[PDB]
Swiss-Prot record:
It comes from Homo sapiens. Residues 5-257 form the Protein kinase domain. The lineage of its organism: Eukaryota, Metazoa, Chordata, Craniata, Vertebrata. Keywords: Apoptosis, ATP-binding, Cell cycle, Cell membrane, Cytoplasm, Host-virus interaction, Kinase, Magnesium, Membrane, Metal-binding, Nucleotide-binding, Nucleus, Phosphoprotein, Proto-oncogene, Serine/threonine-protein kinase, Transferase, Ubl conjugation. Pfam families: Pkinase. It is an enzyme of class 2 (transferase). This is Serine/threonine-protein kinase pim-1.
Amino acid sequence: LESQYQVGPLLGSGGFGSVYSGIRVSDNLPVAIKHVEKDRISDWGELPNGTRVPMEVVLLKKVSSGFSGVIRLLDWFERPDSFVLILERPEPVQDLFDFITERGALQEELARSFFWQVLEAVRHCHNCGVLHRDIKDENILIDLNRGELKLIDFGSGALLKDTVYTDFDGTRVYSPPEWIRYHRYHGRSAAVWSLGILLYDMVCGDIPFEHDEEIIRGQVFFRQRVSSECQHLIRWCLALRPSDRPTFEEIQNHPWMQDVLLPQETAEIHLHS
Ligand SMILES: NC(=O)c1cc(Cl)c2c(Cl)c(C3CC3)n(CC3CCNCC3)c2n1
């Protein structure tokens, strides 16, 4: 049926739908229960059969196998007017947006650990043929006990492909200049641009660009003291020409990314575990 789950408080609502705290009754596992109205759903996909479902379900199934820094889909249900997704829920948890709101710009050692884990999660998605298309601090959860980050909300995502994309429903201030100007981008280089925005966000406490004109110009001004190596990596991710941007391999081999803390180290030093 679907009272295999006890429903708790509303955790949040927005373009992603309505998300409730929940518990799976069979083993007390913490879950998040996400309701999405069918009419409010834009991009659709389908499973290895008829079964037309939200793209989000297709993508999560493709990445939810195995361990990773991606939130796992435990189950889903269809109702007459909506879909309901059952997702794993860290506890205690705080999204990266709220974490940055409370603590301001992050020390580089902590930003390094977080950014590294985001890179590994995004690599996993791409390796599984999934492109997220809305990487940003609001879509990243922190498991405060373990110091492990989780990517959420694949509702703007798509199957990864090597040809040009001409559709985009992600967050605009995270979208690349080629999308702003031409409404065209390729998957990896757009993702790397958003990773540059995210890294700036972490070490400066706010995003670099607010307006189309700023994104198009691509001038990065640093409002906080940031190391030259970090500045260099960020400016590389934010290269105006897509082909001038680093690959994931080049990002992880960059001098700023060396000697990352383990997740548990991160929690003990910076999240006091
Ligand atoms: N797919 C989603 O949109 C989704 C998935 C999950 Cl597992 C969660 C969880 Cl947990 C939360 C609340 C713990 C913040 N939320 C609410 C969000 C947390 C980050 N942005 C603010 C509301 C979740 N949302």
